Structure formats: C-alpha cells, structure tokens
Amino acid sequence: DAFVGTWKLVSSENFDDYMKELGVGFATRKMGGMAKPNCIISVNGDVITIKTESTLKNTEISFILGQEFDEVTADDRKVKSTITLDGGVLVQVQKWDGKSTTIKRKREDDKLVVECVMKGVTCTRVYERA
Ligand SMILES: Cc1sc(NC(=O)C2=C(C(=O)O)CCCC2)c(-c2nc(C3CC3)no2)c1C
C-alpha cells in the first residue's frame, strides 16, 4: 500500500538508549547501532511481510492485522506481537515477561518514520525509498 516498497534507513535518534532499555547487551547494541538496514514491505491478500536486511543481521515477520503472532526479535527476545492499522499508522506491540514495547510505522512526505518506545525512551528512525 502506502507502505509497500524497499526502504533504506537514512537517520536514527536514540536507538542505543532504546536497545539498552530493552536489556540488549553491548555486543548486539554494537551490531545494531551503526547498522543501516533495508526494510522491505510487501502485502499479498490478508498477509503483510516486513523484511529487515542488514549486513550482520536479517529478520522477517509475516502477519495478519489484528492477529497475535510469535516473533523472535533481532535481539533474541521471544515475544507475542500484534499489529494493527490505526489512522494510517501500522502500530506494533511486542509483549514478553510482563513488559511491552511499541513500534509505530507511518508515512510522512517521502519518509517512512518508525517510532520505537520502551518506558521513557523514544527512538525515531527514518527510512527513504531505495
Ligand atoms: C542490524 C540490526 S537492525 C536492528 N533493529 C532494527 O532495525 C529495528 C527497527 C527498524 O528500524 O525497523 C524498529 C524496531 C527496533 C529495531 C537490530 C537490533 N534491534 C534490536 C532490538 C531493538 C530491537 N537489537 O538489535 C540490529 C542488530
């Protein structure tokens, strides 16, 4: 849709702090910090696929809106994830061990803007079309 395409990370703010608040150890935060992933979003029928591709780590999720799914995150958390569409924003929550984090994906001008929240920490990542 508005989201479909191949997107390249161009800017990131507060990602290390976000990873820290998730309990991500130094080695994984080092891998993630200066990573510049591609994000490849596609849809077929009910099913949306979001692939994240980077030199040291790839991940992928496929989901139906509103339907919880199991996810292994890039930092090896086993989480229960639900993604919904709310006012044009893809809202993802991950729940594990009585905690939650939210990842919101929205389109703004030429940007795919990804807001990641854990407790008091807010990180913002911006992608543009590859
Ligand atoms: C090479 C890469 S990329 C990447 N994470 C992203 O790109 C992420 C997002 C996005 O921009 O889609 C949005 C949500 C957070 C993550 C990691 C990594 N995340 C984590 C914890 C924070 C989940 N630990 O490592 C690494 C090692």
Side-chain angles (χ1 to χ4, degrees):
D1 44 12
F3 291 97
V4 170
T6 299
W7 297 94
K8 171 69 172 188
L9 182 80
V10 299
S11 70
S12 183
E13 292 139 41
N14 305 330
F15 192 47
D16 186 62
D17 282 345
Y18 174 71
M19 288 189 285
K20 196 156 196 58
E21 200 77 11
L22 295 170
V24 181
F26 177 82
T28 301
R29 298 209 317 287
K30 178 168 204 79
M31 180 171 341
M34 271 175 73
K36 298 289 252 189
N38 295 310
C39 183
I40 306 99
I41 299 175
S42 59
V43 65
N44 307 272
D46 291 326
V47 183
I48 298 169
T49 303
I50 299 179
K51 297 185 180 175
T52 296
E53 286 189 359
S54 86
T55 304
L56 291 176
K57 186 67 179 207
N58 307 296
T59 62
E60 182 176 303
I61 61 170
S62 286
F63 55 95
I64 293 170
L65 298 162
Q67 187 186 307
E68 187 172 74
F69 56 103
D70 297 304
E71 178 180 1
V72 177
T73 65
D75 59 309
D76 304 307
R77 282 172 292 124
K78 265 78 157 211
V79 308
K80 295 294 194 185
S81 291
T82 309
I83 306 180
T84 61
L85 192 58
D86 183 21
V89 173
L90 283 167
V91 181
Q92 174 176 16
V93 56
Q94 294 174 340
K95 297 172 59 179
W96 76 105
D97 291 333
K99 307 172 265 192
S100 67
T101 184
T102 61
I103 303 102
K104 299 181 181 176
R105 295 173 172 96
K106 67 183 192 188
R107 296 273 288 94
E108 179 184 308
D109 295 342
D110 289 330
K111 303 173 179 163
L112 174 68
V113 178
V114 184
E115 178 204 66
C116 305
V117 170
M118 181 59 175
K119 299 179 191 171
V121 174
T122 311
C123 156
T124 301
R125 291 164 67 81
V126 178
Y127 294 76
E128 288 181 16
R129 294 193 188 266

